From a paper:
Aldehyde oxidoreductases (AORs) are tungsten enzymes catalyzing the oxidation of many different aldehydes to the corresponding carboxylic acids. In contrast to other known AORs, the enzyme from the denitrifying betaproteobacterium Aromatoleum aromaticum (AORAa) consists of three different subunits (AorABC) and uses nicotinamide adenine dinucleotide (NAD) as an electron acceptor. In addition to the catalytic W-containing subunit AorB and the FeS cluster containing protein AorA, the protein contains an additional flavin adenine dinucleotide (FAD)–containing subunit (AorC) that enables the enzyme to reduce nicotinamide adenine dinucleotide (NAD+) alternatively to viologen dyes. The enzyme is involved in the anaerobic degradation of phenylalanine, benzyl amine, and benzyl alcohol, not only mainly detoxifying surplus aldehyde intermediates but also taking over large-scale oxidation of these aldehydes in the absence of dedicated dehydrogenases.
Here, we show the molecular structure of AORAa, the first bacterial multisubunit AOR, with a global resolution of 3.22 Å. Unexpectedly, our structure reveals that an extended protein filament is formed by AorAB protomers that is nucleated by a single FAD-containing AorC subunit. Our reconstruction allowed the model building of an Aor(AB)2C subcomplex with good geometry and refinement statistics, while the third AorAB protomer of the complex showed too low resolution for full structural assessment. The repeating units are connected through a polyferredoxin chain generated by lined-up ferredoxin-like AorA subunits, essentially forming an electron-conducting “nanowire” decorated with enzymatically active W-cofactor (W-co) containing AorB subunits, reminiscent of another recently characterized polymer-forming redox enzyme, the hydrogen-dependent CO2 reductase (HDCR). It binds four iron-sulfur clusters through conserved [CxxCxxCxxxC] motifs, which we numbered FS1 to FS4. FS1 and FS2 mediate the electronic connectivity to the AorB subunits (11.9 Å from FS1 to the FeS cluster FS0 in AorB), and FS4 of the proximal AorA subunits connects to the FAD cofactor in AorC (9.5 Å from FS4). The largest interface in the complex (1662 Å2) is formed between AorC and the proximal AorA, which takes up to 16% of the surface of the latter. The conserved Arg41 bonds with the 2′-phosphate by a salt bond, while Glu294 interacts via an H-bond with one of the ribitol hydroxyl groups of FAD. A β-sandwich domain (residues 1 to 211) forms a base that is linked to the W-bis-MPT (W-co) cofactor by a magnesium ion bridging the MPT phosphates, as well as two α domains (residues 212 to 418 and 419 to 616), both surrounding one of the pterin moieties of the two MPT residues.
Author numbering:
A (entry chain A), E (entry chain B): 1 to 616
B (entry chain E): 1 to 424
C (entry chain C), D (entry chain F): 1 to 158
The structure:
C-alpha cells in the first residue's frame, strides 16, 4: 500500500529523534496528506494556543500516490496553526522533495518544541540527525542549498529551507524548495523560524515498495494517462501558455480588480499577458520565455522559464540576477501588476525574483503595497514616514519597497505586518481587503456571484482553491452556468469543496481535474491501497474532512460573525464592463448554504450530521 | 535437493560456503577421513619451527562456525561408488545417497622402492602424525638426511635448518628446483645454501638403508657413489599422486588425474571435481595438466560450486605460480619460464648481478608476455600474473620492456587499466 | 538489423519518467536512484540533458576485465555483463572515459545499459518523444531534412 | 552506506604529500617507502597516476589465505589483515592480479590499505583534491556531467 | 630535532669512507644548510688555494626541515669555492634528492682529494661504497641515470651527476639531478669534474624520526599551510603561469635589457611571454605547455612541462628530442631571448633542452653568446675565425653555437671561457657585463636603483637572489615604495639580505616569502628543533652568517675595489620608456650602506660588531 508506516517525531528541545509506527484505522478513514496530518494535530494539541510559541507543532506529510508511476504524483503538504489568521493552515507544494521523502522510507515528519541553538536536519534512510547551522543563519535559500550540497559532496540531495523573512518573522513568509515552487499564504515560514530550525536535507535510496497490486496499478495508470493526453486544455493549452492565459479572458468579462479594488478593468492588461511574454524585445530581439518545465512525474509541464533583460534600470548594475529562473504565474502577475496599476513586465520579473530568493509571498506583499499606496494617496501617510513618493503606477517605488521589505530596514518593518494590521494601526480598517486576515485572490466578486460565497465560507481565509466555481461560470467544464444568478449555488460550492478535499488528500495535482474526474481516480486508489475504496467512501471521506476542519476552527474561537465582506464590495457598484450596476448579494445565499450543509443557522454541526459521518 | 562433498580441505570448505550462499534451501554434507578439524597442510613447516601451536593450523577458528550456515559434518572414508543408481558405500558399513557429487580428495605421497624403507626412523612429511613424529625425533644436535631437492623439499630443508641441526640433501637430478627455475638461478640458490651451512651432493641416488645392532642408534645409508652416511632421521620427499581409489570400475574417465572441461564437470552428468585431483585445460594451448597449488584449488572450487548450484560460470584456464623462501632468499616464477622456439617469433631478456644476488628474466612469444622468473623482487610482484593471465597486447611498450624490464606495472597501467589517462 | 537510442534534449522537461521505468524493469521496486540513464539539469542556461551509454565499438570496458565477464551480442550489438562470472573488482569503472557502467553495492556487481534485448522500456514511457529507438545508421535524417528546408532560402521577396 | 576512494589522475602534481601521512599514521615515522598508496610517473608524456587497492567483493587474497588471517569489516566494507594470526607465507602476494598487498620485512608480515576504519588520512592531506572519499555507487557522475555538456551541442551559433 | 647527527667524510685519494658525528654547539648557532656547511668549509680550509686543484673541498648539505611534512621542505645545497669568480659559492637545488639523503640517515657529505681513476658513489642506509665508472665517462646525464638505474635493478634510486661540459671543465658547468632540475652559477660542475667524480646515487629506507614534539609540529604545519593557500599569488598566479608571468610586467616598466645592454625595451617580448605558451600552434592546434609539476612536499606547483614541435627545422631530423621535458624559466627565456634579440619560441626550448642535457648554465652561456655577437658586429671577430655569421636575431647561429659549446668543438672552446676572459683576450674589457666574474640577471639597474646596490654588494658576484628589492618596488608585498628614489634603500637591502639568509638556512623555498613572514616561520622551527629559537636569535643568526661570509671573502684577496659597475650602466642614459634619461647612482648609496652595516669605510668588520655577534 502507498503508505510506508513510519513517523519521525523529533524533539527540537533536546534532540532525540526516535521512530514510531503509523496509526492505521485512521489512514483508511482520512487517506492521508490532508486529513491524517490535521487529525494528528487536532488530536494532540489545544486550539486556544497562540500561533507562535514552543507549544505549537508543525507537520510535513505526503500522500499514498506520492512518488509512484501515476501522473503528477509528487506533491506534499505542511500543516500547522497559521500566525496570519488564527485558524488552521495547510500549504501544498510540489517540486521534487515529497518524492525523495517517500523514497527515503518515511511519510510524515513532526516538529515540536524550540531549539536553543540554530540547527538543521539531515536524513539518510534510517539515520536522522540534527547538525549545527550557525554559519548558515542569515543567508538566502539559494546560498544555503548550494552550501549544504557542496559541503556534503553529493549532487543528489534535496533541500528545503527559508530566507531572511522567515528569520525576521515576517507574517507572510514561506518555505522554498528547488529555487522556486514554494508554499505560502498563511505564513508558515514564521512558524518554522520561530522554532529555530533552518533547513531539511534528505537523500533516499530505499525505493517505494509495497503496492498491493503491481500489474493492476500499471494498467490503471496507463489507461488514465490516455484521457489526459487527448484533452485540448491539458495537451496544448497549459503546456504552451501556462496559467497566465486566463488574464485577458478575465479582463474581457470585467471581473479583474484594479487599484485596491477600485476598478473592475485594467487598461494595460494586454501588456502583461502571455502574448506579451511571447513577443520579441526591441533591445535584443529575443523573447522573455525560454522553455517549460515539469514537476516530478507530471506529463503536463505547465511550468515557466524566463530570463530578465540586461538593460533594465532595476538590474543594470547587478550581474547576480542575469541567469535563468522561474517565470511569472497568474497571481504573481496580478498582485505585482493590476493591483497597483503597473504595466512594466521587467519590474514584475525583478520583484518575483526577489520574492523567490528571499522567501516571501507575492500576493500578500502586492496587496499590502496597494493598501499603502491608497493610504498615501488619501493623505494619512506622508513622504517623510515612507521615505519615497508612492503614487499608483510607480515601478521604481515597487522595486524599492520590495528591497526594503525583503531586507527589513525602515518602512519595510511596517510593511511586514500585513494589510489588516497596517490599516488598523492608522484608524482605517475599511481599506483592508481581507477576510479572516487573508487578502483576496485575482477574481472579483461583483461580476461573479459564486466566488463571493466561496471567499466568505472558507476554512483558512480568503482562498480560491478550496472551492473553485470559476471552472463552471467561465470555462464551464462540468456544465456551463450563468455568473449573473444566485440560484443553485450552494450545491455547486458543496460539491466543488468535497471534490477538492478528496483531490488534495489523494496526493496529485489539482489541475488534472480539467480532464479527469472521480471515476478516473477511483481505480488507481483501489489498485494501490487496501480495503474498500468506492465512490460512497470517497464522498464520505471528503465530507468528514471538511466537517472536522470546521469543528476545530469553531473550537479555536472563530464563529459566524467573521463570515462577512468589506463594505466596498457589497455597497459600491461597478464602473465599467459588462457587469454594470451590480453588487454582491451574499446575504441571500448564506442561510441556504447553512441549511444545505446540515448545520445549525449559527454555523455549528448538528448531532445528526455529526453522528452520520462517525465524527463523534 | 542434496549435495555430498568428499574431502574437507580448502576446496571442500570453499565449495560448501559458496553453495550455502547461492542456494539457501538445500542439504549439504561434507566428509573427511582424518581425526582433526578442517586444516591446511601448507602451515605444517611453521609448526616445525615452533612459531605457532598446532591449533594455529586450523582453517576456520571462529567457534561453532559450521552451525550458523547449517552445514552437516560427518566422518568416514569412501570406498565404493555406484553411479547407475547414485549410491556411495563407506568403509564402516553405512551407506549414503546423493543428487550431486563433488570429488576433492587431494593427493598422497609416494615412496621409492628402496630396501629397508619401512624402518621406524624413515618418515615423510605430509600430515600431522608425521609432523609429530619428526618433532619427536628431531632433537637439537641430531643427524638428518633428506631425499629430493624440489619445492616441498626446499621448504622442509629450510624448516629443519631453522630448527638447528646438521643437514644433508641427496638429489637424483642435475640441479636444485629443476621444474621452476633456470640453471643460473638454481646455481645461485645452491651456492647461497652451501654458504649458509647445508651440505648438498648432486647427481647421486640412495642405494640402500641398513639398520645397526639396535633401534636406538642411527642408520647407515649407502649412496650410489659408494660413500656411507650415518643418520638418525631420514626424510623422504619424492613426489605425490592423486587419490583415485574408487573410480577404477566406473564410466568416469580417468588419466593421471580426473579429466574435466572448462566449466568443471567430469564425463558423467552430475559428478564434479576440483582441487589436486582435477586435470583441467591449459591457458596457452589447451591440453590437460595437473597443478597442485592453493590458488588453483580456491578458484576451481568456487567455479565448480557455482556451476553445481544451477547457475552458469566459466573458467579461463590454469597457470603455475610459485614463490619460495629459503634461509632469507626470496625467489619466484610465473608461467612458461623456459621460453619458446625462436622460429615462431619469440624473444627474451635476462639481467643478472652475481655479487648482489639479483636476477630477472622476461619472455615474449608474440607481442604478449609469457613467463617470468626473479630473485629478490618482492614489491608489486603480483602484476606479472595480471599481465600473463589476461593476455595484454603490449604493442610499442614491448620494445621498452626489452631495454628495461622493471617497468611492468607501468605497462600494465598504460595498456589495460587506464589507457585514456595519458592522451593529453 | 541493428538499432540505437536517439536522445533529443530540446524536448525534455525533467519529469523523471525514464528512471522509474528503467529501475522497475530490472529491480522490481520503483527507485530512480538505481537506473542506468540520468538526467542532468543546468540551471543557469535552463537546459536539461539525459545521458547513458553509447555502446562503443572499440570498447574500453570490454578489454580491461581480467576474467572475461563482458562480451558482445550479435543480435542487438550490445555489450553485456554476465553477473555470475563478475567478481566485483571495480576496474571496469576506471577504464571507461565517459563515466557509465557503475557499481551496485546491494548485490555486489556492476551495471550498464544493455538495450533491454532490443525492447527499450525508457523509450515507451516518454510523453514528449525526446527518446526514440531508431536504426543504427541514418540518425541524422530528421535534422538534415529540416536544415535542408530552412537553409535554402526561397526565391521570394527578392 | 559504504564509501570508497576516487582517484583523478589529471590533477596530481607528484608532491608525495599523501605517502608521508599514510606512513606516519601506521608506523610513526615519516617514510614514503612504507606507504600503502603509490604514485607512478610517466616522463615521455608527463603524467602521474596514483595507485591503491580497490577492495574487491570476491577478492583473491581472502580466499587464498591458508590460515584465515584476512577478514571483512561489515561497517566500512574493507578487507583487514589481523597481524597476529598471519605467518608470512607470502602466498597472498602472487595471487593478486594488480599486486597491491605487499610484504614488510621489518616486522615480517604483510600490509594493504584498510580504509583507516572510515577515516582516510590521504584524502585530507592532498591539496589539489585528486583523492576523494565518496559513496561507492555513482563514482562517475562528474564525467557524465562533463560529457553531457560537451557532446550535446546547443542550438546556438547556427 | 630535524638533524640526523652524521657526516660521511669520504677520501677520494684512497677511498676510506668513514662515518663521523655532527658537531653540536655549531648547529644551534647557524641552523644548518647554509651556515653549518660554510662554517665547516671555513674552519678547516684556507682562503688562498686556487679554485680547481686536489687541495679544494666540496660539501653537500641539507636543512632541519628538509624531508618533513612542512610545505616546500625538500631543498639541498652545494658549498665550495667557485672557479668562475674566486669567491665562496653556495648553490641551491630542489627535486627529490635532499629528501632521499635525509631518509637514508645522513645529512652532510664532504668530498676531499682527487681520485686517480673515474669513480661514482653509492649509498644504502649504512653502506656507502665507491665503484669504477670508466664506462660512463663521456655520456650525458640522462644516459648515466638510466644506466645506473638499470644496472642496480631499482627504479627508485635518486641520482645526481654531471655531463660532458664538466669533464671538459667548461667554466660555467653545473650539477643536474632529476632530468631538468639543476644547480648553476659559479661553475660548481668544474669543481665536481676536477676530482674524477661522476655521480652520486642514494636509496633510503629508514625515515625521518627525531622530532622533539610531534603533535605540535603537525598542528603548526597545518596552520601555516592555510596562510599559503589564502594568498592570490601562491594560489592562482604561480600554479597557472610559472615564473614567466614577470616578462610583460618588467617590459612595461622599461627595465628589460636587450642586445647586450644597448636597449631597455624589447619589441618582441609579447612573443616569448607566458601567454605565448598557452596558445594553440597553427600546425597542430595544441599549446606548447602540457601541465605543471611540483618539487618534494611543495603545495604551490610552479613547475613547467613543455613539448617541442616535431616540424621545426632544428629537430625535424632528430627523433631523440620528441618527448616531454622541462620548460622555460624566466631567466633562461631572457638570456637565450632578449639578451640576443631572438623572437622565436621553439629555438629557445631547443637551446634549453641542450643546456639541460649537457649540463650548462643558460644565463652565463646566453650572455657570453651576446658578447661574442656584439664583438662580431663591431668587427673584431671575422667570419673565418667563427666559421659562421652571427648577426643579432639569428636563431640558426644560436643553435649552432649551442651545439658547438655543449660538444666542445671549434669556436665553442673559446665561448666556454666566459664573457670576462673572452673579452679580455681580444683587448676589450669594457664589453663584459659582470661584477666579480658573473654576468647580470634579467633586471636592469638604470630604472631601478635597489637592484644596482644589491648587485654591487653581493657575496658571490652579481646575484639577484641574495638581496631581492624588486618585491618591494614592483610587487610591493610588504609595502609599495618608489623605484625612482635613492632614499631608504640601505635598510631595505640589509633587511632583505638577512631574511634571505635565514630562509636559505631553514631549508625551504624562497617563493613562500610572497605570503609568509618570520612570524609564520618561527613556530615550525621552534617545534622542530631543540633550543630557544626566538626572533632575536633568528636575526642574530642572519647577521652572523652574512658577516662570516664577508670575512672569508675578504681574507681571500677580494677588497673594496671590486664593488664597481661597468661604465655603460653608469654613463649611458636610457633611450625610451618611463625611465628615459636616467642613470645609476651607486656612488650616493654605497657609503650609506657601509655606515648602516657597521663596517669600516673600506668594507671591513669592526671589533665592536664582531664582539657583539660573538665572531671572536
Ligand atoms: C607455496 C606452497 C607451499 C606448500 N607447502 C606445502 C607443504 O609444506 N606441505 C604440503 O604437504 N603441501 C604443501 N603445499 C601443497 C598444498 O598445501 C596442498 O597440496 C593443496 O593446496 C591442498 O589442496 P586440496 O584441498 O585439493 O588437497 P587436500 O587438502 O589434501 O584435500 C584432501 C582432503 O581429503 C581427505 N581425504 C582423503 N582421502 C579421502 C577419502 N577417501 N574420502 C574423503 N576424504 C578423503 C584428506 O584427509 C584431506 O583432508 C604447498 C603449496 C604451495 C602453493
Ligand atoms: S500541472 Fe503544473 S503544477 Fe501541477 S504537477 Fe504538473 S507542472 Fe507541476
Ligand atoms: S567488475 Fe566485473 S565486469 Fe568489471 S572488470 Fe571486474 S570482473 Fe570484469
Ligand atoms: Mg504552493
Ligand atoms: Mg637551482
Amino acid at each position: 500500500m502507498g503508505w510506508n508506516r513510519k513517523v519521525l517525531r523529533v524533539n527540537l528541545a533536546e534532540g532525540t529523534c526516535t521512530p514510531e509506527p503509523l496509526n492505521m484505522q485512521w489512514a483508511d478513514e482520512y487517506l492521508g496528506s490532508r486529513g491524517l496530518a490535521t487529525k494528528y494535530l487536532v488530536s494532540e494539541t489545544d486550539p486556544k494556543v497562540d500561533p507562535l510559541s514552543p507549544d505549537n507543532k508543525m507537520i510535513m506529510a505526503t500522500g499514498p500516490l506520492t512518488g509512484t508511476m501515476a501522473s503528477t504524483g509528487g506533491r506534499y503538504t505542511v500543516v500547522t496553526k497559521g500566525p496570519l489568521t488564527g485558524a488552521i493552515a495547510c500549504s501544498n507544494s510540489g517540486g521534487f522533495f515529497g518524492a525523495e521523502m517517500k523514497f527515503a522510507g518515511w511519510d510524515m515528519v513532526i516538529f515540536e518544541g524550540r531549539s536553543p541553538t540554530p540547527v538543521y536536519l539531515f536524513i539518510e534512510n534510517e539515520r536522522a540527525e540534527l547538525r549545527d547551522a550557525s554559519y548558515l543563519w542569515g543567508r538566502s535559500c539559494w546560498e544555503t542549498e548550494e552550501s549544504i550540497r557542496a559541503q556534503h559532496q553529493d549532487p543528489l540531495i534535496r533541500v528545503s529551507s527559508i530566507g531572511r523573512a522567515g528569520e525576521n518573522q515576517v507574517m507572510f513568509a514561506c518555505i522554498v524548495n528547488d529555487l522556486h515552487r514554494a508554499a505560502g499564504r498563511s505564513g508558515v515560514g514564521a512558524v518554522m523560524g520561530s522554532k529555530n530550525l533552518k533547513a531539511v536535507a534528505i537523500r533516499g535510496t530505499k525505493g517505494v515498495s509495497g503496492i498491493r497490486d503491481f500489474p493492476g496499478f500499471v494498467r490503471a495508470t496507463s489507461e488514465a494517462k490516455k484521457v489526459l493526453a487527448g484533452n485540448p486544455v491539458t495537451s496544448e493549452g497549459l503546456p504552451k501558455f501556462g496559467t497566465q492565459v486566463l488574464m485577458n479572458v478575465i479582463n474581457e468579462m470585467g471581473a479583474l480588480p484594479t487599484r485596491n479594488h477600485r476598478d473592475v478593468q485594467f487598461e494595460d492588461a494586454s501588456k502583461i499577458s502571455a502574448e506579451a511574454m511571447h513577443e520579441k524585445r526591441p533591445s535584443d530581439g529575443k523573447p522573455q520565455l525560454v522553455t517549460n518545465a515539469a514537476c516530478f512525474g507530471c506529463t503536463i509541464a505547465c511550468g515557466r522559464i524566463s530570463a530578465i533583460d540586461k538593460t533594465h534600470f532595476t538590474v543594470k548594475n547587478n550581474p547576480k540576477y542575469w541567469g535563468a529562473s522561474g517565470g511569472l504565474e497568474y497571481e504573481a502577475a496580478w498582485a505585482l501588476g493590476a493591483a497597483n496599476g503597473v504595466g512594466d513586465l521587467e519590474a514584475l520579473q525583478y520583484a518575483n525574483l526577489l520574492c523567490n530568493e528571499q522567501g516571501m509571498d507575492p500576493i500578500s506583499f502586492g496587496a499590502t503595497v496597494g493598501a499603502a499606496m491608497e493610504l498615501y494617496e488619501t493623505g494619512v501617510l506622508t513622504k517623510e514616514r515612507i521615505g519615497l513618493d508612492a503614487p499608483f503606477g510607480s515601478a521604481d517605488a515597487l522595486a524599492k519597497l520590495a528591497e526594503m521589505t525583503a531586507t527589513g530596514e525602515g518602512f519595510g518593518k511596517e510593511i511586514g505586518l500585513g494589510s489588516k494590521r497596517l490599516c488598523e494601526k492608522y484608524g482605517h480598517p475599511e481599506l483592508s481587503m481581507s477576510v479572516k486576515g487573508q487578502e483576496f485572490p485575482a477574481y472579483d466578486s461583483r461580476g461573479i456571484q459564486g466566488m463571493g460565497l466561496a471567499y466568505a465560507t472558507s476554512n483558512r481565509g480568503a482562498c480560491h482553491l478550496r472551492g473553485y466555481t470559476v471552472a463552471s461560470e467561465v470555462l464551464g467544464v462540468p456544465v456551463k452556468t450563468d455568473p449573473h444568478v444566485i440560484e443553485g449555488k450552494a450545491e455547486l460550492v458543496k460539491a466543488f469543496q468535497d471534490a477538492t478535499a478528496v483531490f488534495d488528500s489523494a496526493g496529485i495535482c489539482v489541475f488534472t481535474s480539467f480532464a479527469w474526474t472521480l471515476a478516473d481516480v477511483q481505480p488507481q486508489i483501489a489498485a494501490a491501497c487496501d480495503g474498500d475504496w468506492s465512490m460512497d467512501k470517497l464522498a464520505t471521506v471528503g465530507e468528514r474532512i471538511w466537517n472536522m476542519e470546521r469543528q476545530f476552527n469553531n473550537a479555536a474561537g472563530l464563529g459566524a460573525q467573521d463570515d462577512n465582506l468589506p463594505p466596498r464590495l457589497t455597497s459600491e457598484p461597478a464602473k465599467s464592463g459588462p457587469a454594470k450596476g451590480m453588487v454582491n448579494r451574499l446575504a441571500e445565499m448564506l442561510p441556504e448554504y447553512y441549511g444545505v450543509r446540515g448545520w445549525t443557522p449559527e454555523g455549528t454541526p448538528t448531532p445528526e450530521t455529526l453522528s452520520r459521518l462517525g465524527l463523534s | 535437493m542434496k549435495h555430498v562433498i568428499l574431502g574437507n580441505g580448502p576446496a571442500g570448505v570453499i565449495a560448501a560456503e559458496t553453495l550455502r550462499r547461492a542456494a539457501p534451501t538445500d542439504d549439504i554434507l561434507l566428509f573427511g577421513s582424518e581425526d582433526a578439524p578442517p586444516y591446511s597442510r601448507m602451515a605444517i613447516p611453521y609448526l616445525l619451527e615452533g612459531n605457532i601451536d598446532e591449533s594455529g593450523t586450523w582453517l576456520r577458528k571462529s567457534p561453532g562456525h559450521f552451525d550458523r550456515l547449517r552445514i552437516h559434518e560427518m566422518r568416514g572414508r569412501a570406498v565404493s561408488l555406484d553411479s547407475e543408481r547414485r549410491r556411495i558405500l563407506f568403509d564402516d558399513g553405512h551407506f549414503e545417497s546423493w543428487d550431486r557429487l563433488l570429488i576433492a580428495t587431494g593427493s598422497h605421497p609416494v615412496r621409492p622402492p628402496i630396501p629397508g624403507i619401512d624402518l621406524p626412523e624413515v618418515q615423510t612429511c605430509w600430515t600431522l602424525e608425521d609432523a609429530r613424529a619428526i618433532a619427536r625425533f628431531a632433537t637439537p644436535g641430531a643427524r638428518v638426511l633428506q631425499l629430493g631437492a624440489g619445492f616441498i623439499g626446499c621448504i622442509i630443508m629450510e624448516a629443519l635448518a631453522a630448527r638447528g641441526v646438521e643437514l644433508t640433501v641427496v638429489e637424483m637430478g642435475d640441479r636444485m628446483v629443476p621444474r621452476m627455475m633456470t640453471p643460473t638461478a638454481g646455481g645461485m640458490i645452491r651456492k647461497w645454501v652451501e654458504d649458509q651451512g647445508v651440505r648438498v651432493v648432486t647427481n647421486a641416488g640412495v642405494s640402500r638403508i641398513d639398520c645397526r645392532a639396535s633401534n636406538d642408534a642411527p642408520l647407515d645409508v649407502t649412496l650410489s657413489t659408494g660413500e656411507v652416511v650415518v643418520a638418525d632421521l631420514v626424510i623422504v620427499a619424492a613426489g605425490v599422486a592423486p587419490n583415485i581409489a574408487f573410480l577404477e570400475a566406473t564410466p568416469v574417465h580417468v588419466a593421471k588425474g580426473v579429466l574435466v572441461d572448462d566449466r568443471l564437470q567430469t564425463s558423467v552428468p552430475g559428478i564434479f571435481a576440483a582441487g589436486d585431483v582435477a586435470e583441467a585445460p591449459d591457458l596457452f594451448t589447451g591440453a590437460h595438466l595437473v597443478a597442485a597449488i592453493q590458488p588453483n584449488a580456491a578458484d576451481q572450487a568456487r567455479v565448480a560450486a557455482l556451476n553445481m548450484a544451477g547457475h552458469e560460470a566459466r573458467l579461463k584456464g590454469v597457470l603455475a605460480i610459485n614463490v619460495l623462501d629459503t634461509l632469507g632468499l626470496i625467489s619466484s616464477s610465473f608461467g612458461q619460464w623456459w621460453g619458446e622456439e625462436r622460429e615462431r617469433g619469440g624473444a627474451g631478456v635476462e639481467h643478472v648481478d652475481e655479487a648482489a644476488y639479483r636476477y630477472l628474466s622476461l619472455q615474449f612469444k608474440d607481442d604478449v608476455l609469457i613467463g617470468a622468473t626473479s630473485i629478490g623482487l618482492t614489491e608489486h610482484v603480483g602484476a606479472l600474473r595480471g599481465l600473463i593471465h589476461g593476455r595484454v597486447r603490449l604493442g610499442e611498450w614491448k620494445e621498452r620492456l626489452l631495454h628495461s624490464p622493471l617497468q611492468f606495472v607501468d605497462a600494465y597501467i598504460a595498456r589495460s587499466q587506464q589507457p585514456m589517462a595519458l592522451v593529453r | 538489423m541493428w538499432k540505437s537510442l536517439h536522445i533529443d534534449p530540446a524536448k525534455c522537461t525533467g519529469c523523471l519518467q525514464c528512471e522509474m521505468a528503467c529501475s522497475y524493469e530490472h529491480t522490481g521496486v520503483i527507485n530512480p536512484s538505481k537506473s542506468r540513464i540520468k538526467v542532468f539539469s543546468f540551471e543557469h542556461e535552463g537546459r536539461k540533458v539525459p545521458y547513458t551509454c553509447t555502446q562503443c565499438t572499440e570498447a574500453w570496458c570490454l578489454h580491461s576485465c581480467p576474467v572475461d565477464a563482458i562480451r558482445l551480442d550479435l543480435t542487438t550489438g550490445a555489450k553485456m555483463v554476465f553477473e555470475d562470472t563478475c567478481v566485483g573488482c571495480k576496474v571496469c569503472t576506471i577504464a571507461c572515459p565517459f563515466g557509465t557502467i557503475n557499481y551496485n553495492q546491494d548485490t555486489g556487481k556492476v551495471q550498464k545499459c544493455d538495450l533491454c534485448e532490443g525492447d527499450p522500456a525508457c523509450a515507451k514511457a516518454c510523453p514528449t518523444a525526446a527518446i526514440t529507438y531508431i536504426d543504427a545508421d541514418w540518425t541524422g535524417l530528421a535534422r538534415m531534412q529540416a536544415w535542408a528546408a530552412k537553409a535554402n532560402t526561397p526565391a521570394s521577396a527578392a
